[PDB]
Amino acid sequence: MSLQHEKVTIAPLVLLSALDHYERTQTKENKRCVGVILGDANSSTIRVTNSFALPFEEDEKNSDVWFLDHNYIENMNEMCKKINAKEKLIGWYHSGPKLRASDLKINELFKKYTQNNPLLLIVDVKQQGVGLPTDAYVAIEQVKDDGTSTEKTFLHLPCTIEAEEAEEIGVEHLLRDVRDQAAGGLSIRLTNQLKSLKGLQSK
Amino acid sequence: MVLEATVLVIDNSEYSRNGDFPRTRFEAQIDSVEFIFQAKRNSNPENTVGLISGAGANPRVLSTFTAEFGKILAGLHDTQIEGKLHMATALQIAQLTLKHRQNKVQHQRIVAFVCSPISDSRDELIRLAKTLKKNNVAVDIINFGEIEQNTELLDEFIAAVNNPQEETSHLLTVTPGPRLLYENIASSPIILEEGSS
């Protein structure tokens, strides 16, 4: 469908929702929570505004075996649009840790509901490192020069974060740190030059 | 069986195409889902039924538990006619769906249509057979696919599942020539199924 998925800007509210809901649906130890991500598209820049949990039960043994109540998604959705009818279904959050090629099948289900290609926004909840805990991937089907008779695949997409005015002021009210991503005075930036070298080295 | 939540498995395989049963076997099963739905409901009005597919590479949820025949029927319109049955994944997903119930009292039953010989190995189906009786879930097999060219593998699996117990499994083998698919299931136990305890 929509090829338009050039950039992904991500609401901090989405993150926050994905982290919290993980525990109040009470899933732990690599038991996946799948929920819907709502926001705008048919736009170059994709903006993920908000999210909601769906119930998700996943069989321990295999990732080809799983329960998802389809009907729930439609019932939730219609009330949610009353609140704000701008928002549309655009894809799904996956609660990490990390990509699977079983997702390709999962994605396809969501595609029925959606009029755009579903975005798979892997919000990692384990927060490894201080670097962004989002990789974004979209299911695309493309041809490849090797010989392969059409490959179906997940291509990495750039993840950044943007917050609304309402959202941004919430971030700053919460924080009470001295901060050091400020890159302000001679001291913060002194650190920042060293920090970047070693940043590079590891990579 | 009063108080029952039923997963139906509809197979939409390259063997349902075949005109074996009037009009086509594929079109026969549509009638068959509606007839089953009304039989179950009249038995005990608090029963419910859902529909999953076994067809395609990955079983696809059409409809979860509903008391409504049109919903199930709406779901029957989405179908892939080039899928291929894969029993092993279908049984496992089917149980899961059954563990969520409007009331905990309702039994767990699968009635599955089987139209093609089971491509999965004999060893897998031996493990599956004892997985099912462990969690008190019985499986009732509508067979008319496997008889065509293969020995009744499905019989050994049913025998292990059946013990003295309220949950009873059965193997129902359907006259393959014309006699109307829904009629055979009608003249067989379908709510006249007894226990074994």
Add this chain to the structure above:
Amino acid sequence: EIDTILSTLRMEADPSLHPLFEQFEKFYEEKLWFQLSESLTKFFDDAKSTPLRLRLYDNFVSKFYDKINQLSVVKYLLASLKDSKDFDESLKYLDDLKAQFQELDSKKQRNNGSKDHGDGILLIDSEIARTYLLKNDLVKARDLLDDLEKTLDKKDSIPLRITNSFYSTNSQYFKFKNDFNSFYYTSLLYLSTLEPSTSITLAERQQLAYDLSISALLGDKIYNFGELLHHPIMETIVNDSNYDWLFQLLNALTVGDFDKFDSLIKVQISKIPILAQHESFLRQKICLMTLIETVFVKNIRMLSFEDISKATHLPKDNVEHLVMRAISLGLLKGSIDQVNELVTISWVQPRIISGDQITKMKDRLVEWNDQVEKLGKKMEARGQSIWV
């Protein structure tokens, strides 16, 4: 009624294929339309070139279109009409089946629930365009191809087969014209999305491969000589008589040996008169190849003219022509200084990364690791007081 038509096929058919015809009818009788489908597929492999396939097969499909899945039917009708010699027969039978489908979908969609009737349409349109190429109505075949392209690509999730036929048509058109550039890229796609079915005859598969190699010699910007060898098309048959001199020319170009090119070329230019009329194109490719190779592997981004002159076995006069031709093609970008006798490259076009080369990258990066690392240490140590 169709019993009698079978009797006719049986007679003219070989005794080896004689049991096949009885079984086809048996499966139909019982109404096992799964087996019926499969039996047809097999038949057509080796009996496409006997007049019995299209006839018998055609009749069967016509009297059992609904019965077997639509996709199967439509692949059968194309196969029969590739083998027709009449272009008039093909055109007619195709427009009849497309017409039928329009009525068919009204009924079917409600009776099945979901039956896809769009497959057959696009497959037809591709073959109709192919019929036209034959009669040299090259202008018509073109605009139907455009019309289709737009259509196909909007259809979001496309089956492999549909775009595969689109790609056969396309290529063909361009090689009538014998533009090498046009043929080559499109051909590569056709091969990539190529049906895993081995129903396409080995003779057909090699023949097409052959064409790509010839175009690529006579081109001006193709350096995929190595790509062909990494693709199955050549990879599996490497013993053929044709694949001696031919593979050897390609490896000649790659390493930029002009003595190896010369010797081969004397023989080959005669054999094929195509290379005679494009004698100039063929002579140029060896030279172009060699200058770019040397610029890539050399880590310094300036090279004297003297190196190129001896490397390429060309006088120094010819160096200025070659760098100029190259910047214009856009193979390389840079500048020409005659007063330091340097040619300064500033951009190199992507290239395959051979095995040997994967090792080289690692080396450049290992050295750059140590540079980062030694620097970080001093700066960690000095100015210890402040990092807060």
